[PDB]
Amino acid sequence: MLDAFSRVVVNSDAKAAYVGGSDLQALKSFIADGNKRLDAVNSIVSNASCMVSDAVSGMICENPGLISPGGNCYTNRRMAACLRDGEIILRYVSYALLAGDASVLEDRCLNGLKETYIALGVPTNSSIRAVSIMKAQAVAFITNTATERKMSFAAGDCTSLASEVASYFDRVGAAIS
Amino acid sequence: MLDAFSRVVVNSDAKAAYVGGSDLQALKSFIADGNKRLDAVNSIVSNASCMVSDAVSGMICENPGLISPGGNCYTNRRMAACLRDGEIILRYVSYALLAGDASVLEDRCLNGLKETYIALGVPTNSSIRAVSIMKAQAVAFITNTATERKMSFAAGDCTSLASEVASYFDRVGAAIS
Amino acid sequence: LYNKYFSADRLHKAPEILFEYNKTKYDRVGVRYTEVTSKASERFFPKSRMNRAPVIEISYREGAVSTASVSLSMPEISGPP
Ligand SMILES: *C(=C)C1=C(C)[C@@H](Cc2[nH]c(/C=C3N=C(/C=C4\NC(=O)[C@H](C)[C@H]4[C@@H](*)C)C(C)=C\3CCC(=O)O)c(CCC(=O)O)c2C)NC1=O
Ligand SMILES: *[C@@H](C)[C@H]1/C(=C/C2=NC(=C\c3[nH]c(C[C@H]4NC(=O)C(C=C)=C4C)c(C)c3CCC(=O)O)/C(CCC(=O)O)=C2C)NC(=O)[C@@H]1C
Ligand SMILES: *[C@@H](C)[C@H]1/C(=C/C2=NC(=C\c3[nH]c(C[C@H]4NC(=O)C(C=C)=C4C)c(C)c3CCC(=O)O)/C(CCC(=O)O)=C2C)NC(=O)[C@@H]1C
Ligand SMILES: *[C@@H](C)[C@H]1/C(=C/C2=NC(=C\c3[nH]c(C[C@H]4NC(=O)C(C=C)=C4C)c(C)c3CCC(=O)O)/C(CCC(=O)O)=C2C)NC(=O)[C@@H]1C
Ligand SMILES: *[C@H](C)[C@H]1/C(=C/C2=NC(=C\c3[nH]c(C[C@H]4NC(=O)C(C=C)=C4C)c(C)c3CCC(=O)O)/C(CCC(=O)O)=C2C)NC(=O)[C@@H]1C
Ligand SMILES: C=CC1=C(C)[C@@H](Cc2[nH]c(/C=C3N=C(/C=C4\NC(=O)[C@H](C)[C@H]4CC)C(C)=C\3CCC(=O)O)c(CCC(=O)O)c2C)NC1=O
């Protein structure tokens, strides 16, 4: 199971991996606190489109110049590209949470991102705000403390996993600062 | 059958030509170790975009003066152009490996390239480093000894084909030195 | 000036090599001539991998752990407005 997931990322082939009950028990035996880790991942990816749109909208209401003419969210093409990058970043942070390891986020998403954004004229300070809203969102879903949506879980404490997503979102800002 | 491949390049018409069945059996009969040759070509073209980008960036990180003001990779126009040249050279080398014949690469790509570089001010020393990185990449994929990705092949020895791509890359540096 | 060797009619054009291979009867090998197109960002984001991210899909229901499944893929993505 782990080798197939690794080969999907290594190949970049866009073909989905799929797993049985004995396979899932092998990956859960490799992972730390898989039961709580898989519910934490599920809490983010069940809300990911709502998360990205709300975060990008928040970056804009705090900095309206982004959507004025010459603004880096001006025209529908740029707005859609900005929502594409918000989703990319959120997806890679989710796989770092599933893996218990920053390496995939660092190596495939964050390496070269600062230089690419500087070359494109993408505002890094505004990018950091959008990411910071996604951090607050993810901590709320993992702890089931979101104000407008509740999710269903077995009772217990998930504070370590919340501290875990915080550290991965903080790596993004640290890379692009 | 290789004359049908050459016909396309002779015409330069951008219309595709395909071989299968008896025509592909004639190609594999005509060109030495075709079965292993086609897998060797497939190993390069499956990785060609990542190869060029890593090599081109590999010449810049070792020589950061290329991306300083007045450097020959400075501004996005020059950077897109360099990355483009990388794909153009790898293209003719992958086709020279398919043919088992360096003459396409020499006649259509390397012929006049030194004088072109000198007239443009393109640094030939740094160009040789980008080519030398692609040489190492191609040898690794053909022998399936790359540390970053494994592909699937029938067991055997491919040393001759690796030593074959070696010389073809070496011809690029020999032309532009 | 480079117009001696690279004329603007033929400038930046290079062969392409194509595989229709699956270990199947109708498998083929293809070649075409083509214009090479690329952009400045590619050093870190090659066109083979660019704009891909990990979709993760999980299926569960309370106490139904015998039915549970997780899936991973990385297609190209378009953020919704
Ligand atoms: C601009 C006027 C502006 C915004 C737009 C908005 C952006 C923003 N969002 C948060 C925090 C959260 N947003 C959440 C998103 C959602 N909640 C849901 O229940 C659904 C599924 C989803 C899509 C609508 C969540 C979960 C949070 C965190 C928990 C909560 O309920 O509050 C913030 C605050 C971040 C911070 O602390 O800085 C911001 C800024 N706000 C604006 O002002
Ligand atoms: C923090 C994330 C949450 C929280 C989570 C808890 N979940 C607990 C148990 C539990 N969860 C699942 C589903 C999960 N495991 C899988 O294998 C898959 C899919 C492949 C998923 C989505 C299961 C099966 C279980 C076992 C109990 C059950 O539901 O029948 C749990 C208890 C401890 C543990 O089992 O590790 C907790 C704390 N709870 C919270 O209150 C926050 C919000
Ligand atoms: C994209 C990731 C490809 C891929 C490419 C490979 N690169 C390989 C080797 C290699 N690349 C560089 C450039 C690199 N080194 C530097 O110091 C700098 C700047 C900081 C850069 C960007 C070099 C120098 C080398 C080593 C060449 C040498 O001198 O021998 C390589 C082969 C590695 C190996 O042998 O295991 C590959 C295949 N790899 C992939 O899997 C994807 C598709
Ligand atoms: C060195 C380059 C490689 C390696 C290559 C080998 N390939 C071998 C056999 C083989 N490969 C193919 C696929 C190829 N032929 C085609 O017709 C097409 C496309 C249409 C492709 C991509 C075939 C069909 C075969 C023949 C056997 C089969 O049916 O699978 C092979 C074994 C040769 C032998 O028969 O002794 C080798 C060595 N192997 C390596 O280990 C490196 C990495
Ligand atoms: C939104 C939060 C930002 C914003 C973002 C923009 N990004 C633009 C282009 C762009 N972004 C990337 C990085 C992306 N591609 C990847 O492959 C990965 C990771 C694997 C990531 C994170 C790339 C490569 C590109 C250029 C290529 C392309 O767009 O496909 C962009 C458009 C720039 C332009 O018009 O040229 C925007 C608007 N903009 C904002 O205002 C906030 C801060
Ligand atoms: C058929 C074969 C074939 C080739 C091999 C290329 C050769 C080639 N490259 C460039 C053009 C260029 N080539 C480079 C290349 C590089 N800059 C660097 O600093 C690096 C060392 C290197 C990449 C590794 C750059 C940056 C330009 C742009 C030059 C310019 O704009 O003046 C041009 C001229 C285009 C122009 O500037 O108008 C040509 C003909 N094209 C072809 O048609």
Author numbering:
A (entry chain C), B (entry chain B): 1 to 177
C (entry chain A): 194 to 274
From the reporting publication:
Red algae utilise a megadalton-size light harvesting antenna called the red algal phycobilisome (PBS)—comprised of rod structures formed from stacked, hexameric protein-pigment rings emanating from a protein core that is poised above an integral membrane photosystem. Published cryo-EM maps for two red algal phycobilisomes contain clusters of unmodelled density homologous to the cryptophyte-αβ protomer. We modelled these densities, identifying a new family of scaffolding proteins related to red algal phycobilisome linker proteins that possess multiple copies of a cryptophyte-α-like domain. These domains bind to, and stabilise, a conserved hydrophobic surface on phycoerythrin β, which is the same binding site for its primary partner in the red algal phycobilisome, phycoerythrin α.
We call the family of scaffolding proteins CaRSPs (CALM repeat scaffolding proteins), where each CALM domain binds a PE β, stabilising and locating it within the red algal PBS. Further inspection of the deposited maps for the P. purpureum red algal PBS revealed evidence for continuous density linking clusters of cryptophyte-like PE β subunits together; three such clusters were identified, corresponding perfectly with the three candidate CaRSP sequences that we identified from P. purpureum. The other two clusters have three and two scaffolded PE β subunits which correspond to the predicted domain architecture of the sequences that we call CaRSP1 and CaRSP2, respectively. For the unmodelled region of LR6 and most of the remaining two CaRSPs, we built de novo models including models for the metamorphic N-terminal domain of the associated PE β subunits. Analysis of each CaRSP structure confirms that they are scaffolding proteins given that two have an anchoring domain and all CaRSPs make multiple contacts with red algal PBS rods as they weave between ‘lone’ PE β subunits.
